[PDB]
């Protein structure tokens, strides 16, 4: 019955609290205690990328860490050479309201989505001198969040739906649904191998899932508000966990636990975006008060400033190769960081 | 895509025509359009330049001052003026279309031609003007410069093109090492500075011809002789 | 009897001068364009050449120099004094502009018409005004001053009006202010200095006192002027 | 019939964990061995530094 | 120094830009207005994914997008006004519509977006009122005190308690309004009969307003 049911969840949840804090013998505050400091990281703008005429709500790096997507809030995507400021493309959208972005590791195709229900994949390298759309991916009741390119022929998306999906390109048909979530899911972020990703909700929980299977592995509670921003360790075997009440976690995925705390007195803006560095030491958090802020992400202390923006950042990337961070704001200017 | 070229007849010396290039299924206006003349006898030489928008304009030392070229982006054609035309102005006249970014492949698709008959620079030689060629095998064609083609940039900007018997030349290697689309992949490009092979894997059919090497650091473009696969 | 007058103004134009670099500054590189940020940026600039001018007037006064030389000074200096009150009164009018017809000054405005307007207002001031201390035509100037007056009293009048008869107006008590500060100063700070430069060999009643009493107060005056328009143009926001 | 959240939790509650020690050790040992290849760590050559 | 082909990179770049700069002319022009206000209500009837309704009256175009407000009401942070729907007629929801108003108008993100408010079906308030057979003091407990202020600006054509309680429903969401706002963001309440053609008119009223608010406000009148 309902009672019983009830029970049963009960008695599993305090079991998995139980497992967890019986793991619970030493903090990475208690080891990384013995680690020398990184000391300083003082970068400064090297490249003001302008162009855009409205808010700027993602961007994305291609694989050669030479070219960067970006859509803005009066519909049109950009192709950007980062060493140049030139720009390459100008994709007019059929909509104008954009909330993600897409650049496929291969280079040829990128995505747009947002208010309009519609993932929009648009090929580049084409002969016809023309930008054009590939194919139109319907099949969403909810405002597309987030759209990641597993391959040349795969892409998953996130909706407003508590849903997420993968679509096959080629053919245009959902491979798999993955449902589980109870609020709007909002982030999602590939997994290095390509074979798992996380992904946040409004709900205030993560869940790991597995691409092939199609099953959660894993839900993470720690938060206590929206998630907005989420992204792998370079490992593959730990995240970092943005919400808007102002704390980054470090969640954990082989002990199922959350290890650092990212959080401060002074702050209360929620994060934006959630970025790593190549070698996993930096996290670059995006937040509202109209900077980022550079965490060493062993030992939970702050770093530097990244304050050159005047309204906030909405989005935030590193390279591949991790030479430069690019930052995006609402101010309708990117900038790139070195 | 299709460029169409009319125009160019029987023409007395002194006179005055007009060439056209007629272009049907891409954005005419986004694309710089060249004129490239091959003489009966002789290889590839370059001509003018217009480019997007109508912005940039660039002549050969040989015609400054006789050609004119202009474009008509409402009804999609290119026009090259002839003034106080000359002997050495016989050729067949090729269009080509070149668009210019990150990752773009100039000199992608060249037109046919208008056969007119009127009645320093990176100067670069083909060592090789005649080698034999045996199907199965494997052919290097060389190709030398005079100043260093490697820009500060990393990009080596050199160009092999193809040329089958009685037909408009192809795109093989853009920047020394690319290969363009519909190229098979036994063609492989190598080089430094001032030195260049186009190596090819088992030559068979359909590959014979003549391979030209241009250079696209510095105006006039400047091509070579030629290299002819027999068999 | 003329020392301290000299110090005064100078020491004020220092002052002036440092907040006019401050305002430079920030609309150079620390905030972006407006439709009224570029005239306030072409007066806070022409207050720097007019108090750069007065700086150097400041030390030559009391050392005995030559006296066609101190008349040149006097000349190129009295050339960036219209460039200033022109562009007091060009924002003044497009600020009526902005709330006579609001649709129109956000919507269907040509961009470059802010340059248009202030390169021509910095062309006309040389052109009318070599017209100068004498260096009979000096009725011109007058005309050309007394008009841009006129101009500035009608746009704040107009502006005045406009928000009289509406309705719920909660910044009632600081439009006011904001728009009466203005005309009263650049109408009793800043007229008398072109108004001392027409009258200046027109009226011959006794160059004596004339030079001292007139020439040190519409000095002293102008300095003030230029010292605190930025102030009170964008401090206040 | 909401059996899809207890089965759900069954088949993620028995799952091999590991020790947290363990597995900070693991985050340490990946920072640790590629700060010597990281450009924004330690500052960059000018000689690699194409911005 | 550059290369040909990087020369060709920059002159294909400035024409993306100007490109870019004449788009920028052309949307600047178009005023843009988000339209809510939750169901039984009358969207459809208000001007004779995101649905995007283009009408032009003085001139001047508007674009009128309706959704169909948690997290993307983030990406309406720039347009000019919104507008709010609200059925005066029924009573029960009424104080659902006033809990989503005051959750539109305590938004973070919205923080200085003016809301135009519409009460649509009058008449049919008019004909529960004088009908008699419901009462608006049974669902609303504080009707009772309410009298008609000495401004009655309603024409005499309606009867007293219809013009009352149009007033108070009015009152209703003008203290909601007028409590906390610091001045950065007000609302204009209007009365409807989805059966009026003159209704674009007091929309390019209100922006106007607008418009001349936003202006003296930039312009340190303020
Ligand atoms: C009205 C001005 C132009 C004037 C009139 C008569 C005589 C003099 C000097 C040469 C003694 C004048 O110049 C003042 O220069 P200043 O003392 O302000 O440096």
């Known amino acids: ?16 609290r139980d497992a967890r804090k019986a793991c619970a013998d030493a903090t990475l505050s208690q080891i990384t205690n013995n680690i020398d400091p990184v000391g300083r990281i003082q970068m400064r703008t090297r490249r003001t990328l302008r162009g855009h005429l409205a808010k700027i709500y993602a961007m994305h790096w291609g694989t050669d860490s030479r070219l960067l997507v970006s859509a803005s809030q009066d519909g049109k995507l950009i192709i950007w050479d980062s060493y140049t400021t030139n720009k390459v493309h100008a994709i007019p959208l059929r909509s104008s309201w954009v909330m993600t972005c897409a650049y496929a590791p291969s280079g040829n195709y990128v995505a747009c989505g947002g208010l309009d229900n519609i993932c929009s994949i648009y090929n580049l390298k084409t002969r016809e001198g023309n930008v054009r759309v590939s194919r139109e991916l319907a099949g969403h009741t909810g405002y597309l969040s987030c759209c990641r390119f597993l391959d040349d022929n795969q892409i998953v998306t996130s909706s407003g739906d508590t849903t997420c999906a993968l679509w096959d390109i080629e053919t245009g048909q959902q491979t798999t649904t993955f449902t589980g979530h109870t609020g709007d899911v909002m982030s999602l972020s590939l997994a290095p191998d390509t074979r798992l990703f ?32 989420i992204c792998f360790f370079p490992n593959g075997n730990a995240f970092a966990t943005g919400s808007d009440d102002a704390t980054c976690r470090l969640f954990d995925l082989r002990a199922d636990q959350e290890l650092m705390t990212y959080s401060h007195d002074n702050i209360i803006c929620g994060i934006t975006s959630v970025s790593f560095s190549k070698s996993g030491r930096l996290l670059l958090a995006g937040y509202d008060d109209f900077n980022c802020n550079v965490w060493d992400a062993l030992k939970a202390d702050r770093a530097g400033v990244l304050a050159g923006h005047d309204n906030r950042v909405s989005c935030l990337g590193v390279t591949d ?3 430069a961070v690019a930052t995006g704001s609402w101010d309708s200017f990117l900038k790139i960081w070195n | 895509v299709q460029l169409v070229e009319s125009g160019g007849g029987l023409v007395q010396p002194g006179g005055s025509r007009k060439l056209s290039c007629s272009a049907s299924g891409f954005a005419f206006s986004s694309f710089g359009m060249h004129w490239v003349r091959q003489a009966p006898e002789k290889g590839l030489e370059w001509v003018a330049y217009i480019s997007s928008g109508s912005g940039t304009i660039y002549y050969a030392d040989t015609v400054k001052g006789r050609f004119t070229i202009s474009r008509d982006d409402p009804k999609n054609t290119l026009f090259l003026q002839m003034t106080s035309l000359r002997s050495e102005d016989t050729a067949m006249y090729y269009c080509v279309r070149s668009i210019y970014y990150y990752g773009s492949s100039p000199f992608d698709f060249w037109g046919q031609g208008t056969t007119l008959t009127v009645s320093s620079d990176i100067v670069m030689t083909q060592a090789t003007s005649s080698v034999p060629v045996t199907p199965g095998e494997s052919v290097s064609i060389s190709c030398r410069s005079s100043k260093s083609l490697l820009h500060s940039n990393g990009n080596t900007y050199l160009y092999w093109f193809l040329q089958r018997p009685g037909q408009s030349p192809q795109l093989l290697i853009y920047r020394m090492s690319n290969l363009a689309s519909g190229v098979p992949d036994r063609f492989s490009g190598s080089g430094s500075g001032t030195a ?22 510095e105006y006039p473009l400047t091509f070579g002789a030629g290299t002819k696969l027999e068999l | 009897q003329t020392l301290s007058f000299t110090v005064l103004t100078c020491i004020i134009s220092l002052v002036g001068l440092t907040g006019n670099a401050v305002v430079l500054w920030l609309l150079g590189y620390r905030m972006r364009r407006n439709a009224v940020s570029i005239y306030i940026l072409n007066l806070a600039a022409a207050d720097f050449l007019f108090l750069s001018f007065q700086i150097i007037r400041s030390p030559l006064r009391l050392i005995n120099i030559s006296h066609l030389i101190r008349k040149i000074l006097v000349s190129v200096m009295t050339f960036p004094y219209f460039t200033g009150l022109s562009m007091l009164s060009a924002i003044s009018t497009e600020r009526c502009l902005s709330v006579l017809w609001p649709i129109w000054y956000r919507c269907r405005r040509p961009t470059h018409l802010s340059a248009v307007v202030c390169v021509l207002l910095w062309g006309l001031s ?12 000096d009725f011109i100037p007058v005309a050309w001053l007394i008009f841009l007056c006129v101009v500035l009293c009608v746009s704040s009048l107009v502006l005045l009006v406009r928000i009289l008869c509406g309705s719920r107006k909660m910044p009632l008590t600081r439009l006011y202010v904001t728009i009466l500060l203005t005309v009263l100063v650049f109408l009793l700070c800043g007229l008398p200095f072109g108004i001392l430069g027409a009258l200046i060999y027109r009226m011959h009643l006794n160059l004596e006192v004339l030079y001292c009493h007139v020439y040190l107060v519409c000095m002293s005056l102008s300095s003030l002027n230029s010292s605190a328009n930025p102030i009170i143009y964008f401090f206040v926001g | 019939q909401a059996r899809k959240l207890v089965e759900q939790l069954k088949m993620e509650a028995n ?37 | 120094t550059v290369s040909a082909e990087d020369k060709a990179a920059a002159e294909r770049s400035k024409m993306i830009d100007k490109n870019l700069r004449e788009d920028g002319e052309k949307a600047r022009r178009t005023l843009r207005l988000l339209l809510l206000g939750a169901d039984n209500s009358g969207k459809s009837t208000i001007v004779k994914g995101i649905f995007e309704t283009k009408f032009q009256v003085d001139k001047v175009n508007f674009h009128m997008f309706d959704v169909g407000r948690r997290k993307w009401i983030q990406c309406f942070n720039d347009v000019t006004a919104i507008i709010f729907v609200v059925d005066s007629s029924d009573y029960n929801r009424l104080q659902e519509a006033l809990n989503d108003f005051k959750s539109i108008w305590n938004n973070r993100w919205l923080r200085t977006i003016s809301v135009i408010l519409f009460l649509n079906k009058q008449d049919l308030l008019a004909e529960k009122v004088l009908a008699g057979k419901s009462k608006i003091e049974d669902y609303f407990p504080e009707f009772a005190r309410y009298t008609t202020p000495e401004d009655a600006t309603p024409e005499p054509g309606e009867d007293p308690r219809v013009t009352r309680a149009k007033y108070f429903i009015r009152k209703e969401f003008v203290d909601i309004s007028t409590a906390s706002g610091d001045g950065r963001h007000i609302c204009y309440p209007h009365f409807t009969c989805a059966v009026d053609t003159e209704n674009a008119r007091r929309i390019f009223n209100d922006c106007k307003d607008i418009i001349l608010q936003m202006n003296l406000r930039e312009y340190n009148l303020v």
Not at chain 1, 209 to 218: A, F, I, P, S, Y
Not at chain 2, 202 to 214: F, K
Not at chain 4, 22 to 42: I, R, S
């Open chain 3, 126 to 137: 040389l052109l009318f005004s070599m017209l100068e201390w004498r260096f009979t035509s």
């Open chain 4, 15 to 51: 799952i091999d964990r590991i020790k947290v020690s363990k597995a900070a050790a693991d985050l340490m040992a990946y920072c640790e061995a590629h700060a010597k290849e990281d450009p924004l760590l330690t500052p960059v050559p000018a000689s690699e530094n194409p911005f």
């Open chain 1, 321 to 323: 190769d991790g030479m």
């Open chain 1, 198 to 229: 996380v992904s946040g909700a409004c709900d205030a929980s993560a869940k790991l899932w597995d691409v092939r299977e199609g099953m959660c592995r894993q839900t993470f509670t720690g938060h206590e508000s929206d998630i907005n921003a």
């Open chain 2, 196 to 217: 260049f092979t186009l190596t090819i894997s088992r030559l068979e059919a359909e590959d014979v011809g003549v391979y030209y090497c241009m250079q696209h650091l």
């Open chain 1, 1 to 16: 019955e309902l009672d019983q049911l009830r029970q049963e969840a009960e008695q599993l949840k305090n079991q998995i």
